[PDB]
Amino acid sequence: VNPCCYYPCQHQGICVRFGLDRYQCDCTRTGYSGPNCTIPEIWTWLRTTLRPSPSFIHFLLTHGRWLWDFVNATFIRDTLMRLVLTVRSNLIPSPPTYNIAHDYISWESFSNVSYYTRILPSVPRDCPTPMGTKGKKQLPDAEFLSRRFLLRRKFIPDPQGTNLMFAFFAQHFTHQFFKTSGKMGPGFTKALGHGVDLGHIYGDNLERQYQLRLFKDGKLKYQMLNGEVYPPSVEEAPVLMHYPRGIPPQSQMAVGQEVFGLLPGLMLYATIWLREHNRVCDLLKAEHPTWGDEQLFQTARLILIGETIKIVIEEYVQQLSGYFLQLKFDPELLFGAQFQYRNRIAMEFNQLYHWHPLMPDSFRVGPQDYSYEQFLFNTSMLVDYGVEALVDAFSRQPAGRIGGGRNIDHHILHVAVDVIKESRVLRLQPFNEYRKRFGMKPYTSFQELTGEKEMAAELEELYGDIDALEFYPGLLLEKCHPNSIFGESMIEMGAPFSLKGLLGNPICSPEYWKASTFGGEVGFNLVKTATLKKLVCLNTKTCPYVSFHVP
Amino acid sequence: VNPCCYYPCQHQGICVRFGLDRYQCDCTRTGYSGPNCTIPEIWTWLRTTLRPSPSFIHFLLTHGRWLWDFVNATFIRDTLMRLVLTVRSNLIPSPPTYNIAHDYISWESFSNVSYYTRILPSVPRDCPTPMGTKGKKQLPDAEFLSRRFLLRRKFIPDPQGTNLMFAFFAQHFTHQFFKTSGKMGPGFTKALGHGVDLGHIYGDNLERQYQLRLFKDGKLKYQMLNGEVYPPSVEEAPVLMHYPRGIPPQSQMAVGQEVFGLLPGLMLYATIWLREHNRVCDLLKAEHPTWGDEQLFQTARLILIGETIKIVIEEYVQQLSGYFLQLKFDPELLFGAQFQYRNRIAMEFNQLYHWHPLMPDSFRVGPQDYSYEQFLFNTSMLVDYGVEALVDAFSRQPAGRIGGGRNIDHHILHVAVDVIKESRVLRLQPFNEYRKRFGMKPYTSFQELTGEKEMAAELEELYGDIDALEFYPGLLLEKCHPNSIFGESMIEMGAPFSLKGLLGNPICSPEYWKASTFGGEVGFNLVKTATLKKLVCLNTKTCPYVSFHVP
Ligand code: HEM
Ligand code: HEM
Ligand SMILES: *[C@@H]1O[C@H](CO)[C@@H](O[C@@H]2O[C@H](CO)[C@@H](O)[C@H](O)[C@H]2NC(C)=O)[C@H](O)[C@H]1NC(C)=O
Ligand SMILES: *[C@@H]1O[C@H](CO)[C@@H](O[C@@H]2O[C@H](CO)[C@@H](O)[C@H](O)[C@H]2NC(C)=O)[C@H](O)[C@H]1NC(C)=O
Ligand SMILES: CCCCCCCCO[C@@H]1O[C@H](CO)[C@@H](O)[C@H](O)[C@H]1O
Ligand SMILES: CCCCCCCCO[C@@H]1O[C@H](CO)[C@@H](O)[C@H](O)[C@H]1O
Ligand SMILES: C[C@H](C(=O)O)c1ccc(C(=O)c2ccc(I)s2)cc1
Ligand SMILES: C[C@H](C(=O)O)c1ccc(C(=O)c2ccc(I)s2)cc1
Ligand SMILES: *[C@@H]1O[C@H](CO)[C@@H](O)[C@H](O)[C@H]1NC(C)=O
Ligand SMILES: *[C@@H]1O[C@H](CO)[C@@H](O)[C@H](O)[C@H]1NC(C)=O
Ligand SMILES: *[C@@H]1O[C@H](CO)[C@@H](O)[C@H](O)[C@H]1NC(C)=O
Ligand SMILES: *[C@@H]1O[C@H](CO)[C@@H](O)[C@H](O)[C@H]1NC(C)=O
C-alpha cells in the first residue's frame, strides 16, 4: 500500500515516497522532529501547550461588551488586529504549493495560474479506500447524503441577524475569485487574479474590459432607465452573458461576471458598484483635468479595490464573526510583519465558501413575496423596483443559518450534491485531516462532531469512520457555535484563506499604499472611509435602511 | 510646461500632476519631507552622511586578499553576504510599478505580465526637449553616436580575465528573461516568468515544452551524433526555431530558446544543460522508482533552477565583481529579512545587460581561428568539435572590456545602434537621473563621466548637457573602475536588478527551500553543490580546462 496513504507525516511534515515501499517525512521548519514529525521542539511544545482552545477564544471575543469597548478605544485594538492578521495568515503557504495536477511543488504549479491551488495533496489514487486507509470502499451517495442532512426541512434562520443584503454581497463578492472553468474541469479557474481584483466589475480579460469601458472620463458604459443609471445593454456593450435562450440582447445587462444576470441580488450590487465607479471618475477629473481616460480608469479601479477590501473587513467580516473587537483595515499593521503580498485561490476555500444555506424560502420585496421561480431569472425586478427599494427589502429579510444541518432550500440543493461529487474528483483529503492541518484536534466520534446522537449515528453507519467523514459534509454538519451562523471549523479554516486573500492584495503593500497611488488625498480617503452605507446612498436618490444586519 | 518634466520630486518622491499647471510630490516613506522630498529625517540624514562612496567600497572589496581570506573563514562572510543581498534589493520595487503603458501604478501594470516593467516613468511626451527640460531638441544620431564612441577600433580585452566561456554563459543565461516580443513592440517580452525559470531549456510555453519532452523517465528528447548526446532535430521535436531559410529541419536543433541556433556558443551551453537534465533524471528515478514522468521532470527542472542560481552567484557573479569576499548562495540568509519572493524584468535592466563589447574580433578554436562569418550560423562546429573541445577554447579566449568605450566589434555594432533607438521609443529618463535613483550623485560634466577631455568634449557638443546624456551611452562611456570590466554605474544599477531576480525566485522562499522540494537529500545537495566544472565534466567524456577566468 502507498505508505503515504496512512498520512504518516504530522504537523505539516511532507510525505515523500522512496523505494517501492518506503517513505520519508520532511519536517523542515515544522517545529517537530522524528520519523513522522512528532517530537516537538521545546518552544513548539510550550507554544502549543498554551494555545487556548478556539472555543475559549471565540467566547472571549463575543463577551464583555464593556471591556471590549475600552480595548477598542485603546492601542490594544491595533495590536490584536495585527495579531489576528499575521497569526491567521501563516496557515496559508506562499508561494503556493500543489494543484490538482501536482501533489508536489513544481515550477508549473507555481506559474500556471489557471489552476486552483490546494493546501493538502490529494488522497493518492493508489490507496485502499477512497479517503486513504479508513472508511468504506464506497463513499455515501452524494444525492442521498444531501437529502438526508442538508435538505432544509424548516427554515432555520441565522441567529447573528445576518440578512439577505449580506448574502447577496457575499455571493457577488466571492464570484470574483471563484470562477471554475467548465470547459477545463474542476481545479481550473478563469479568475486569474486569484483575489480581489474587482474583476467582476471590469470583466476577467482586457477585451471584455474594453467592451464595458466608456473610453471617456474614466467612465464605464452604462444606460438610463426611468432616468436612473443601470448597466448597459448587451446590445450596447456586446459582451458574453449567461441568460436563457430567448432573452434578447436588448433585455440583457452587460456587466463583467457573465453569470451575474441570473438573480436581481447580483445585478443590484453590480449596479451600485458601477455607479460608484463612474462617480469616483468625476472626482478624479475635477482634481486632475490633465488626466486621460486610461489613467482616470486605472485609478478609479484602484480606489474601488481599496473600498472593497475596507467594507469587506470592517463591516462584512465584522458581521460574520460576531466579535466585539472592532476589526480594522490598515495595511500598515503588516509593514512590520514578514508578509508576502501575493494570493492564490485554493480549491478548499471555494468549497468552504459554498454558503447556499443563506438563501431563504421565498424572496419578499415589501408586501409582495416572490418565489424562486419569479426571482431567479427576472430581468425586470431591478429596473422595476429600483436600487433603493431592493436594498431596503434585502436589508430586512434575514438569511438562514449556515452551519448546523438541514437548511439548504431544495431549489438549490443540487448545488451541494455537485460540490460533494466535485470534491471527490479533486480527491480532497478527509475532514479530520484538514481539522488537524488548520490547527485543530481531530474529532473522535460522529456524536462529537454533530452535537447529537441521531444524525451522528447515521453518519457513522454511512461513513464507517469519523476519519472518513469528508470535507464539505463535515463542514456543514459540525455543530454550531452557541448562537453562531456556523461552527468552529468554518471559521478556523476559512478565516486564514480569507484574511490572506485580503491583505495579500498588492495595493496593501508598502509600495502601493501611498496616497499618490489613488490620485491624491481624495482618492486615498475614499478608501480609508468606505462604508456600505456610503456605497449605497451616494449612488441612490434616497438612502434606504442599508445594513448587513437585519434591523 | 509639464512641471513634472523638471523632475521636481527628489529621493524617489512621486510627481503627481494637479490642476493644469500644478504638481505635488509624494514623499511617502521617502525619508524626506518638503515640496520636493528634500528635507531629510534625522536618521535619513545620518544614514546618508555616512555611506562610504561606491568607489571606496569597491576598493575595499578588492584589496587585502589576506584580510579577506580570514573574513571568508569566519561568520562575517555570511553577515556581509546577507547585507549585500538585502541592501542591494531594496532598490528594486515589489510588486512592480510602471510599464511602457502606465507611468503610474495600475492594476493592469501589476497583472499584465507581457510588459517589461520600469523603475522610472518615461520622459513625458509633453516636455520641452526629449530628455525633459535640458539638452537639445534633437538627440544625437544613434548611428553616428555609435561609430564615434562604441565602435571597436582596437580590441581592448577585459582586465579581469573574463573569457569567452563567461561571455557565452552570460548571453545564454540572460536570454531566458530578456525575450522582447518583436510582433508586440518594445516594452513587451515573451519571457513571462520574468526570471530564472530555466525556460530557455524547456521552452517558454507548455506546448513547446511538451514538444521537447521525451515523456519517459523525466527525460528530455535528444539525439546521438558520433555516439554523443546533442539536442534533438527540429524534425524529431517539431518546434519553431530561427535558422536562415534553406537550412533543413534535419539540420536544425530544437532547444527552447528559438534564437539559440545562431551561434555555437549558445547551442554548446544548451547541450550541456540538456545532458545535465537527463542525468538528474536518472538519479531521481533510482531514488524514486515509484515516480512518474511528470514528477521526475518537474523535479529535475527544480534541481536545475537551483544549480543555475548557485553557479550564477558563487562563480559567475564572483567573477564579474572581482571581489575578494567569497559570495554565497544560501536562501536562508534572507529568512530573517523582509523580502518578497517575486521578480519582474525591467526594461532598464535589459539595456544595462547589453554586454556586446564582450565579443572578440575572431573566434579561435585551437590552431584554427574562425571568423564571424564562419561562426555566426555554423550548424556543424558543435558536432564537429564536440563539447569538451569548444569549452577548452572558449575557456581560454579572453573577452573584451565592457565599459570604457570604443570596443564593440563592427559585426554587431548595429545592435547598439538599435538599443539607443529603442531606449528613445521607451522614452527612458536621462542617465544622470538614474544615477541619482540608484543611489549615486549625478555627474557634473562630461569630462567627469569619461575620465578624459577628448570624448568628453564631443559628447558635450553633441548632447549639450550632461543632464541630457542618455542611459546606454552614459553606461558604456562612463570611465571604468581601476582594472575593471566596467564602471561604477554598470554595477551600482545592475547589481540590484540582478540579485533581486536571483533571490526572488520562489524556490528560494522558506516554503520551497526544503529538501523534499528537490526529491530528497540527493536533489538538494546537487543544488547546494553545483559548479561550472561539475556541470561540464559530468556530462562530457573528458574534463577540459573549464572556467570563467582565462587561464
Ligand atoms: C439563490 C441564489 C443562489 C443560487 C441559485 C446559487 C447556485 C449556485 C450554482 C448553480 C452554482 C454552480 C455549481 C453547481 O451547482 O454545479 C453555485 C456555485 C457557487 N455558489 Fe452559488 N448560488 C446562490 C447563492 C450563493 C451564495 C449566497 C453564495 C455564498 C457566498 C454562493 C457561493 C457559491 C460559490 C462560491 C460557488 C462556487 C462557484 C465556482 O466554482 O466558480 N452562492 N451556486
Ligand atoms: C556574437 C554574439 C552576439 C551577437 C551576434 C549578438 C547580437 C544581438 C542582436 C542582433 C540582438 C537583437 C537586437 C537588435 O540588434 O536589434 C541582441 C540582443 C541582446 N543581446 Fe546579443 N548578441 C551577442 C552576444 C551577446 C552577449 C555576450 C550578451 C550579453 C549577456 C548579449 C546580450 C543581449 C541582450 C540582453 C539583448 C536583448 C534581447 C531582447 O531584447 O530580448 N548578446 N544581441
Ligand atoms: C496550464 O495548465 C493547463 C493544464 O495542464 C494547460 O492546459 C492543457 O494544455 C495542454 C498543452 O497545451 C493541452 O494538451 C490540454 O488540452 C490543455 N487543456 C487542459 C484543460 O488540460 C494550459 O495550457 C496551461 N496554461 C499555460 C498558460 O501554460
Ligand atoms: C497585455 O497588454 C497588451 C497591451 O495592452 C495587450 O495587447 C493588446 O490588447 C488589446 C486588446 O485585446 C489589442 O487591441 C491590442 O492589439 C493587443 N496587442 C498589443 C501589442 O497591444 C494584451 O492583450 C494584454 N494581455 C492580457 C492577457 O491582458
Ligand atoms: C482575545 C485574544 C484574541 C487573539 C486572536 C488571534 C486570532 C485567532 O487565533 C486563532 O486561534 C486558533 C487556536 O489557537 C487557531 O486555530 C488559529 O490558527 C489562530 O490564528
Ligand atoms: C566592505 C563592506 C561591504 C558592504 C557591501 C554592501 C553592498 C554594496 O553597497 C552598496 O553601496 C552603494 C553606496 O552606498 C549603493 O549605491 C548601493 O545601493 C549599496 O547597496
Ligand atoms: C477576524 C476573524 C478571525 O480571524 O477570527 C475572521 C476573519 C475572517 C473571517 C471570514 O471572512 C471568513 C471565515 C470563514 C469564511 I468561508 S469567510 C471570519 C472571521
Ligand atoms: C555582489 C555584487 C555587489 O552587489 O557588489 C554584485 C552582484 C551582482 C552583480 C551582477 O550580477 C551584475 C551587476 C551588473 C550587471 I548588468 S550583472 C555584480 C556585482
Ligand atoms: C510513523 O507513522 C507510521 C504510520 O502511522 C507508524 O507505523 C510508525 O510507527 C510511526 N513512527 C513513529 C516513531 O511514530
Ligand atoms: C419579475 O418581477 C416582477 C416585479 O419586479 C413581477 O411582477 C414579475 O411577475 C416577475 N416576472 C416573473 C417571470 O416572475
Ligand atoms: C521644488 O522643485 C521645483 C523644480 O525644481 C523648484 O522650482 C522649487 O523651488 C522647489 N522647491 C523647493 C522648496 O526646493
Ligand atoms: C563551420 O565550422 C567548421 C568547423 O567546425 C568549418 O570547417 C566550416 O567551414 C564552418 N562552416 C562555415 C560555413 O564557415
Tab-separated table of C-alpha atoms in Angstrom, chain A residues 113 115-116 169-181 188-200 204 257 260 308 312 316 343-347 349-350 353 497-498 501-502:
chain	number	residue	atom	x	y	z
A	113	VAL	CA	-2.218	30.331	-12.872
A	115	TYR	CA	-5.096	26.007	-11.592
A	116	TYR	CA	-6.844	26.448	-8.230
A	169	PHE	CA	-22.929	40.782	-1.094
A	170	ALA	CA	-21.087	37.562	-0.135
A	171	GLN	CA	-22.300	35.812	-3.263
A	172	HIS	CA	-21.463	38.747	-5.535
A	173	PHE	CA	-18.058	39.262	-3.913
A	174	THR	CA	-16.922	35.679	-3.918
A	175	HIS	CA	-17.760	35.382	-7.592
A	176	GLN	CA	-14.765	37.450	-8.489
A	177	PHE	CA	-12.277	34.780	-7.397
A	178	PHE	CA	-14.304	31.564	-7.600
A	179	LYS	CA	-14.979	31.136	-11.333
A	180	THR	CA	-14.354	27.476	-12.179
A	181	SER	CA	-13.686	26.715	-15.858
A	188	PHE	CA	-9.190	25.187	-13.175
A	189	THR	CA	-10.491	28.739	-12.647
A	190	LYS	CA	-10.994	31.525	-15.133
A	191	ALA	CA	-10.434	34.064	-12.425
A	192	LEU	CA	-6.726	34.548	-12.946
A	193	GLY	CA	-6.019	37.337	-10.492
A	194	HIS	CA	-6.818	34.958	-7.672
A	195	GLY	CA	-8.116	37.629	-5.377
A	196	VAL	CA	-9.917	40.917	-5.064
A	197	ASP	CA	-9.056	42.314	-8.481
A	198	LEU	CA	-12.563	43.725	-8.714
A	199	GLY	CA	-12.795	41.800	-11.944
A	200	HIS	CA	-16.476	41.030	-11.659
A	204	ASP	CA	-11.789	38.980	-16.416
A	257	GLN	CA	-19.264	38.479	-14.435
A	260	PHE	CA	-24.472	37.748	-12.646
A	308	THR	CA	-13.948	46.806	-1.314
A	312	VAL	CA	-15.213	43.536	3.489
A	316	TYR	CA	-18.765	42.215	6.261
A	343	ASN	CA	-2.604	35.276	-3.110
A	344	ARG	CA	-3.824	32.140	-4.981
A	345	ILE	CA	-7.392	30.722	-4.751
A	346	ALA	CA	-7.451	27.300	-3.138
A	347	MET	CA	-9.976	24.643	-4.084
A	349	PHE	CA	-11.503	27.689	0.173
A	350	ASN	CA	-14.010	27.508	-2.689
A	353	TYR	CA	-17.402	29.261	0.860
A	497	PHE	CA	-7.843	31.773	3.377
A	498	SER	CA	-9.904	34.947	3.834
A	501	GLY	CA	-6.535	36.942	0.142
A	502	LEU	CA	-7.468	40.335	1.546
